[PDB]
Structures are given as C-alpha cells and as structure tokens.
Amino acid sequence: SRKKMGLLVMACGTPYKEEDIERYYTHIRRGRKPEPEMLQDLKDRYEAIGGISPLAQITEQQAHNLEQHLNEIQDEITFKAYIGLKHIEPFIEDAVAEMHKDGITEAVSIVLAPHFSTFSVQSYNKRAKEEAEKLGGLTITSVESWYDEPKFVTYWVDRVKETYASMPEDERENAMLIVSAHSLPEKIKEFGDPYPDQLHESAKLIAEGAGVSEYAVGWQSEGNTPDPWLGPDVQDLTRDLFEQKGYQAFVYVPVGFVADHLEVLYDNDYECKVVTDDIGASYYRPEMPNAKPEFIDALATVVLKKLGRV
Template identity: 60%
Template sequence: MTKKALLVMAYGTPYKEEDILPYYTHIRHGRPPSDEALQDLTERYEAIGGISPLAKTTENQAQAVLDMLNEQDKENEYELFIGLKHITPFIEEAVQSINEAGIKEVVTVVLAPHYSEFSVGSYNKRAREEAEKFGINVKSVDDFYRQEPFLDFWVDAVQGAFKEIPAEEHDATAVIVSAHSLPEKIKEHNDPYPSQLEETAELLKSRVNLKNVHVGWQSEGNTPDPWLGPDVQDLTRDLDGTFKYKHYIYLPLGFVCEHLEVLYDNDYECKVVTDEIGAGYHRPTMPNTDSRFIQAMVNELLAL
C-alpha cells in the first residue's frame, strides 16, 4: 500500500464571533472592512443562529471523502489534511503538515463542483506552489459536476421539492439553478465557470424533464467591479413580472452544504422576495455528507 495525502480544500468560515474581523480582513487582501461592513456581516451570522455551521460540515465532508476513498482504493492508503482559503488551517499550513508527515504524494479536491481559475484554480495553485518547496507531487480534481452521483442527488432534490407543490401548479413553478457569483472579468479569459453552471442546468433538465429552469447567480462580493448576473433576487422579480410563477424552487447547487450563502442569501433574502410577490418558496436540503455527493468527488479522485 502506498501512503498518500488527501488534501480537502474549502473556503473556510469564522469559528467564533471574534474570528469575523480577521476572516473578513483576509478576504479583503489584508484591508480591514469598514465598521458598517463588519456590522452587516456580523448581523448576517446572527440571523442564521450566530456562526455558520460550515466549519463542522467541512470536517464531516472531508472525513466522508477519506473514508470512502480508503474503502474503494485498494492500492493506496490516504491520510486526511484540510486546507482553507481564508482562515486557519490555511492551504499552505496543510501542505506543511503533509511534508512533516513525510508524505510525498498528494491528491486534492476543493469542496466546489464547478471550476474557475478565480476559485478552484486558485486553491489548486496555492497547494501546488507550497508543495513544490518540499518536492511533493500534487494531482488535483478540477470539477465534479458531471458525475452521475452528483446529478442523481440533485434530481432527487428537485423531485422532492415538486412533491411539496400541488400537481396542478407544477407548470406554474420556476426552478432557479444558482452558484456563487464571480467578477464578470473572468469572461475575458474564457473562464469555464459560467458555461459549467449552464451545462449543469441542462443536465438536470434532461433527467427530470423540467420546463421552467432559469440560471442565476448569488452572494456577489462587495466590490466596485461588476459581477456575474442576474442575481437570484432580481431574477425572481423579473420572472414574476413576466410569468407570474406561483412557486420558486431554488437549487443553489454551486454550493455544497447549509452555510451563510444558503441559509441567509437564499432562505432569508430570496424568501423576502417570494413573500413580497405572493409566491411559494422552496429550497431542498443541501448535499452535506450525502453518499452520492461524496461518491462524485471520490470518482474524480480515483481517476487522477
């Protein structure tokens, strides 16, 4: 058996309220946020119960990937390391720990199904650059949204959501597929991210025979640059003006678990809009540690 490291990377989240300022400062490349911006973020966390459940869920997802990978790969034995983008353990710290463990072969996966140079690409680059310092070989998963188990999960999710809606109102139901917005400038470099989300929507449509599927973006950053749109809230209002849908099913499938962007940006902000227009709000449970979601990542890791 060959010993390898499994490096699972994710965005990271504050562990406690005191972490919010340094976390937000790191996201802003070392520039502290204004008091107003910090207060706004703190209030968003308070609105979902204090602090995001993301940290624990990331650990659970990483452990689930490790367990399944070790079970299915009969030639290698993996040890788990977690590396985060904006809070400790940072990606570089995780690679340093891999080096200290004496492991020279690493496979990596980011807890995000779609690829952008701006997101997953930046995680992989940080891991690779740190690994080069120690002569560690890195192989990385870029995306896993085409994996059948991933699609199976979301097929079941959207079908489950339709069961909450009277059959006679299915034709008056919109499905909004979304992911985290990124700056529009990524299009200048032919970044695959926008087309991958569109493709995911088409893959779902072909499997469920969905009629009213719309692609939106959410959770854009607070910067002067334009971000990918339409924003899901604006999209909902526009669709109401054009189609008068009675129900909206939100599938934030660019995300992987219940956290701030889903619990606040969808369950609070989008619901404000559906309440305002008198439509029903629906959002299936996120993948979290569902075995199909975990298998999608493991399939890609085994193929490296």
C-alpha cells in the same frame, strides 16, 4: 501494501466562532477590515441562520467522511485527509506543509466547489502546487471540476424531483427552477474562464434529470467592486421571471455551493425568500449536500476517476 496518498480537501473556510468574523472577512476583503456596522450586521446574519459553529464543522465532516469512504471502497490506496482553506486557518499552504512534514510524497486534491474558475479553483490548486514545489519531494494531482460527475448530478436531480413532488398541483404546474453559483467578476471572460458555461451545464443536467422544463440560471453573492460581476443576481432574476410569467413557486438549487454557509442559508433562504414572500410565491431550496453519504460517494468517485482507478 497499500500506497499512502494525501487527500488535500480545499474550501473557502468559515469562521469558527463569532470573534473570527472580523479576521475572516478582512481576509476575503483583501486586507480591508469591515466597518463596525458591517461587523454587527454579519454577526446578526450568522445568528439568524442558527450560529457559526455548525457551518464550520461541515467541511471537516466532508473531509473525514471522504477519507474514510475512499479507504473503504477500494483496497489499493490509503488516503489521509488534510484540509486546506482559502480564508482562515488551516490555510492551503499549512495543509501542504503538514502533508510534507508527515512524509506524504503523493497527493490528490479536490476543491469543494464543483465548477472550475480561474478565480477560485485554479487559484487554490496553484497555491497548493506552489507550496509543494517550494518544499520539494511532494506532488499533487488536482481535480479541476466535477459538476458533471453523474453521482453529483443525481444528488441534485433527486432532491429537485422530491421538491416538485411535494408541491401542490398549481405550484407544480407554475414553478420555476433557479440554478445558481457564486458570482465572479465578469472579467474572467477575458481568460476564457469556463465557469459560466459549467454553471449552465450543471443547470441543464439537473433540470434534464429532474424532468423540469422551466428553469433559469442565475448568480448570487456578488461583491462590491466597480468592475461588473456575473449576473443576473438571483433576487433580480426571481422578480423578473415573476413579472414575465407569474410563477407561483421558485425552487433554488445553488449548485455552486456544497454546504450550508451564509451564502445559502442567508443569500437564498433569507434574501431570495424575501422576494418570493413579497410576490406571494412559495420558496423551496433543497438540502445542501453537506456530508451526506450520497454526496461523499460522488466525491470519492470524482477522486478515483481522477486517479484512473475507476
């Protein structure tokens, strides 16, 4: 009959309620509890973007919809989704342990971040595989990147085309597309990490499919460590390009992110919008994929291609 396979869907995680902010950020900060002013700031930011709990639901919806779509579009494998998160329960290791307890012996994994990096994707995949090895009798084949899946490129291409079509003529003629992902420490370059190259390729593919000749690649959401992070940051890039050529509209495609979270709804829709409001340009940031059918179909195609079934 149908072969059973685990579908390990991995992501960063989000707090589930305001009282989870402390523990989630302590985890991201490697055990350093945020000071009270930062905790208050973070709560205010989540309030300003409409609340925490919707953000927390998106990953679950993505995993659910992906499982059901994969099971509909082919007839050989029955997938069961398990969510494994980096910074809050259910953790990657919990998910693998659950797959093992449930009798899964073969799984495929995907990280809900389309570009490979050594800091994120490789670390999630290594955590999942090490837990599988420790438990024994369960193997995981892991997607490493998927930014170049044509269906995923097309998601963003069509959103960009719609945004440009929506602009008044003077904006459309004097607009800049900024394509971004989460910054990482610059030291990843010592490993030959392809993350920057893959962001630039994402940007090339999206601008090309959308027919957008003027675009730039930037990074966002860098951390505070003395070591440099990848730049330029989108806020500085926006101002710099404005000072160079006077763009009247900036379109932000944070292609490294697949769902609403603070690092889009705040780091673009507030922090970049501050800059565009200051320089008098219009701000546009098309919808994140979230759990939209077009994006789920792209992910399902990524998974089936990884398994050689397409």
